[PDB]
């Protein structure tokens, strides 16, 4: 009843990246 959900567990997708940071990471938006 007091369990905290572990979002890095085997039943979860990969952490959702920041959209702006994802765009900048792939070199699509300049600073």
């Amino acid at each position: 009843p007091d369990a905290v959900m572990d979002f890095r567990g085997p039943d979860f997708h990969e952490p959702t990246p920041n959209m702006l940071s994802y765009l900048k990471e792939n070199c699509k938006v300049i600073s």
């Binding site: 009843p1 905290v4 959900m5 979002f7 997708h13 952490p15 959702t16 994802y22 699509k28 600073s31």
Partner: protein
């Protein structure tokens, strides 16, 4: 999504990223190299130099001060002055491109917006046959282009083929075929029936066919229905090409794909135009199918559909944006040329085309909607909707009755339960949990492949489009069955060719193994859903979207295990973006430091949604705790420990109690009131704007004439209500004077509360006066009351009609009174048995200190799987806690309870438990309305419409029929003349009733009849009302 449930916003996330990569480049092309008529000045864009820069305003700032979250577009242009033969290239400014949030929503003018997906008929060739008046079968083949252009090929009674374009414009195939240049010789050889085409060759058509141009002119005559002989010209073909070839002959990449399949053609993919062979090949099947060769096309099949995401909608508006820019430049280059000046490339292009067409796309387009922020469940399900409506789609009146039905191609792609209620039923869908949008606009769901021994099969999870869905034998059963034979010969239910079979395992290709495969988020939050009738599942999904976040939240004892998925993908909780350690925590912020990177995460404190619901976050970690990237840091509203928490676990009995739970009424205890179990915060926003009038701009001041100091007691020196003041109905919020009449902002009826936020802000503009805006936010603590609506997750809704003291409620054998009493008669008619399972298991979990997250359809393991789970957990709680009433061997789940008023037991055992009950937005204090008199409409002079406008109630024609059925002719006249629109008689009724001196008959016409007479006068018609005296037969003209 091969091995886990995918992100609920992954379709929005991937669509927008596709637009950035390929949508911009594919649309920045096609931009014409703009040249003047003289060809002197040539303006062009260098699309390979296009760039986007990160927005200058932060995403929090964009919504805070009503801005738009967008990024700059900075392509480069080259202007050619052949007069000087010199080139100038500069980084010109094109516009602002809105940016999608990680949650999948845009921000325009400080308003969250969501772009929903659309369903429409996929391009290709479609074969249909419709009966005529006499029942003679008439076949038809229809070409659908990339823009909805329909080219109908029809067979008439005389077997003559006509390429119908409109309801009247009819053109033969030979003229159309020879319009493009198909010589009459080769048309006959490429079909199996040269005779049929030759039989319809009148001597007039042959001469026009013989030459290419005469076919074009005749085709124009039949297509345009214009009297006279047109002259062949280059402009005529271009005019026809835009109207006909541009809209009815470009298939596209998808359109070519289907035509190659349905017409069985080996044509290269790159050919995105309707080749002339396709038309001639289509006529072969069309005539050939008339003789039993083939099958008709299923129009409701999902393999004949496409899905347009935010990628297609944002790219299309860019097609309008740049086409709107070229018309701006053409006027600009022509204007500067007439002045013989050399304009810099920046001054030839303004940012209005891109910025405005995106500003007006979210504002006006039906597929762009305001994000619903009632609770975390509404934030994510709104973005996953599929609609047949919108531009290019059928309307509710337009919608066919065979549509709105469930098609076998929907399984795993469109939820069969979730749909809208009302006229739009069956037209607004919802994506399944595991559904994915393919690369052809088709929906895909994952299936597990069973293959032979000699096959690698590295990944056996393959996503299946509806086109290939039919031709696989897909089973949903299990392999827990053995007889004296072998396992491969055991039979299981399966799907094949849109039907349900029962075949052996050795003939099964794919298995459906995911538990939430066929459902949407709403239906996937219902525990024991397989015991509820599917009719209530639709209602239950809607009610969960209306749940109000409570001032304190708690997790459900019984769930499905999807609550953690909903919490993660909603963005309401705080999720770490970097691994590290927790160093500091408080209400306003959480400080996380990891790998020499120290971040500070602010927490939302008592913020307002678009639905007047409070948003609030509390920390979920302590100082000194190590954190992984992607793990929870804090809990938001309606979220506990990383799970969706929309309700409370309360003690509940299912019995009738003295008629106070009659029909759907709910009897509750005072403990739910003074315990603040169902207390919610509600925040309204009141805005006032300052405008510049002819007499002068509006002024804001504390000093207001003809007002008491008691009303203005909460104002500051500037004239605005003080932060942290308890306002009242009729109190003053913003004191404003219009030259000066009082035009101040007052608190409406029932809005009493505490002022929590004031925003005195100026919008900087190019005028000498800047519009001042004031926003007052008022919190209202609403405990549960009589008339509020509560519901469970099984379609069990009800109104609170009675609140009792705890000593009056029925109580259990441990002496505890129950909190709610529900009518047991609501189960058999509503056929939702899953609520009986949940309440018994919720009681067991509370005693055992356990929570349960149960996937649906647990009877796939064994018969009565839910019964064994609930009964064994009820007995475990009974045995461990020494509470023999919790599990009764005589009648499991039911126990004898006692009357709180007499102490005597009720005769029959009562099913008791601890279910999960939600509090809904539909409640009193937002629905109670009253009116004596007041403001009336300007034209009809009838009382206004709406509770917010202090309007009256309408007595429609069906209510007039009832009054005529009773014969109450004087009640009817009151509601027709001097309570609605008889201006003279309304003022006399107000006077007589205050002196109590009898109301006389109006005897004159109301303003609605006089309004009709004038309108009839405007049509040169006179309508006179005459009274003929029965005494002397004198005709009297009534004033009208």
């Amino acid at each position: 999504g091969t091995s886990t449930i995918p992100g609920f916003n992954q379709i929005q996330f991937e669509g927008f990223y596709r637009f950035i990569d390929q949508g911009l480049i594919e649309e920045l092309s096609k931009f014409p190299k703009i040249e003047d008529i003289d060809h002197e000045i040539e303006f062009q864009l260098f699309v390979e130099t296009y760039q986007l820069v990160e927005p200058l305003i932060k995403e929090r700032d964009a919504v805070y001060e009503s801005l738009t979250y967008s990024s700059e577009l900075y392509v480069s242009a080259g202007l050619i002055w052949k007069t000087n033969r010199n080139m100038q290239e500069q980084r010109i400014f094109i516009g602002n491109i809105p940016l999608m949030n990680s949650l999948g929503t845009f921000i325009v003018n400080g308003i969250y917006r969501v772009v929903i997906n659309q369903i429409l008929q996929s391009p290709g060739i479609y074969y249909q046959s419709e009966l005529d008046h006499n029942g003679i079968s008439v076949y038809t083949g229809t070409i659908i282009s990339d823009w909805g252009g329909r080219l109908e090929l029809e067979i008439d009674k005389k077997a003559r083929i006509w390429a119908r374009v409109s309801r009247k414009q009819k053109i033969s195939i030979l003229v159309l075929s020879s319009a493009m240049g198909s010589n009459l010789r080769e048309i006959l050889e490429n079909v199996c029936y040269p005779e049929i085409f030759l039989s319809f060759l009148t001597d007039k058509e042959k001469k026009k066919i013989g030459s290419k141009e005469n076919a074009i002119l005749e085709f124009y005559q039949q297509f345009s229905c214009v009297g006279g002989d047109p002259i062949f010209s280059e402009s005529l073909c271009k005019e026809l090409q835009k109207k006909f070839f541009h809209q009815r002959c470009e298939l596209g990449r998808i359109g070519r794909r289907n035509i190659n399949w349905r017409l069985n053609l080996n044509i290269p993919q790159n050919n995105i135009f309707l080749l002339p062979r396709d038309i001639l090949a289509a006529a072969d099947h069309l005539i050939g199918m008339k003789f039993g060769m083939g099958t008709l096309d299923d129009m409701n099949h999902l393999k004949n559909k496409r899905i347009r995401s935010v990628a297609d909608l944002l790219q299309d508006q860019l097609g309008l944006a740049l086409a709107r820019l070229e018309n701006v430049v053409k006027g600009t280059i022509g204007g500067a040329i007439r002045h013989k000046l050399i304009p810099t490339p920046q001054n030839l292009v303004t940012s209005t085309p891109l910025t405005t067409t995106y500003e007006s796309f979210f504002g006006l387009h039906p597929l762009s909607q305001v994000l619903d922020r009632t609770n975390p469940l509404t934030q994510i399900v709104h973005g996953r909707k599929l609609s047949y409506l919108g531009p290019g789609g059928l309307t509710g009146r337009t919608a066919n009755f065979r549509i709105r039905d469930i098609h076998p191609s929907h399984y795993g792609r469109i939820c069969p339960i979730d749909t809208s209620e009302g006229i739009n039923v069956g037209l607004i869908g919802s994506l399944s949990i595991h559904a994915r949008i393919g690369d052809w606009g088709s929906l895909e769901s994952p299936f597990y492949e069973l293959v032979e021994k000699s096959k690698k099969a590295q990944i056996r999870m393959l996503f299946l489009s509806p086109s290939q869905d039919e031709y696989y034998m897909i089973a949903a059963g299990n392999s827990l069955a053995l007889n004296r034979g072998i396992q491969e010969e055991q039979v299981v239910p399966a799907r094949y060719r849109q039907e349900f079979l029962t075949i052996a395992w050795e003939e099964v290709h794919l298995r459906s193994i995911f538990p939430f495969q066929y459902f949407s988020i709403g239906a996937s939050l219902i525990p024991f859903i397989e015991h509820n009738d599917a009719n209530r599942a639709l209602m239950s999904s809607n009610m969960q979207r209306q749940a109000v976040p409570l001032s304190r939240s708690e997790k459900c004892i019984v769930g499905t295990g999807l609550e953690r998925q909903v919490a993660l993908d909603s963005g309401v909780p705080a999720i770490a973006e970097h691994e590290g350690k927790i160093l500091y925590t408080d209400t306003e912020k959480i400080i996380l430091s990891g790998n020499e990177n120290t971040l500070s995460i602010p927490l939302i404190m008592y913020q307002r949604s678009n639905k007047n619901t409070c948003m609030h976050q509390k920390p979920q970690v302590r100082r000194g705790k190590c954190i992984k990237k992607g793990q929870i840091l804090a809990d938001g509203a309606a979220t506990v420990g990383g799970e969706l928490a929309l309700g409370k676990n309360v003690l509940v009995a299912y019995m009738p109690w003295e008629g106070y739970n009659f029909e759907d009424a709910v009897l509750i205890s005072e403990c739910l009131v003074y315990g603040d179990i169902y207390t919610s915060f509600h925040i309204r926003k009141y805005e006032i704007q300052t405008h510049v009038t002819t007499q002068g701009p509006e002024r804001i001041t504390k000093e207001i004439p003809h007002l008491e100091g008691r009303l203005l007691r909460n104002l500051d020196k500037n004239g605005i209500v003080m932060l942290g003041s308890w306002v009242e109905t009729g109190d003053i919020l913003v004191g404003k004077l219009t030259p000066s009449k009082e035009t101040c902002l007052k608190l409406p009826i029932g809005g009493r509360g505490r002022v929590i936020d004031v925003r005195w802000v100026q919008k900087k503009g190019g005028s000498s006066y800047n519009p001042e805006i004031i926003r007052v936010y008022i919190s209202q603590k609403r405990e549960i009351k009589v008339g509020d609506k509560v519901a469970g997750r099984h379609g069990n809704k009800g109104i609170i009609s009675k609140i009792l003291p705890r000593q009056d409620m029925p109580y259990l054998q441990d002496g505890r009174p129950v909190d709610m009493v529900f009518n047991p008669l609501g189960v058999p008619s509503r056929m939702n048995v899953g609520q009986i399972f949940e309440c018994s298991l919720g009681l067991a979990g509370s005693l055992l200190d356990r929570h349960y997250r149960i996937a649906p359809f647990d009877e796939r393991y064994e018969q009565e799987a839910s019964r064994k789970l609930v009964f064994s957990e009820l007995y475990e709680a009974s045995k461990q806690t020494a509470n023999p009433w919790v599990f009764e061997p005589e009648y499991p789940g039911k126990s004898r309870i006692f009357d709180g008023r007499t102490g005597d037991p009720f005769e029959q055992p009562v099913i008791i438990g601890k279910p999960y009950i939600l509090k809904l937005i539909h409640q009193v204090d937002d629905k109670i309305h009253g009116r004596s008199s007041g403001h009336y409409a300007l034209v009809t002079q009838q009382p206004l419409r709406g509770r917010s406008k202090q309007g009256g109630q309408r007595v429609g024609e069906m209510e007039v029929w009832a009054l005529e059925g009773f014969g109450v002719a004087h009640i009817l006249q009151e509601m027709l003349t001097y309570k609605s629109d008889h201006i003279r008689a309304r003022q006399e009724v107000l006077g007589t009733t205050i002196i109590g001196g009898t109301i006389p008959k109006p005897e004159d016409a109301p303003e609605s009849f006089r309004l009709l007479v004038r309108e009839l006068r405007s049509l040169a018609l006179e309508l006179n009302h005459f009274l003929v005296s029965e005494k002397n037969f004198q005709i009297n003209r009534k004033e009208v």
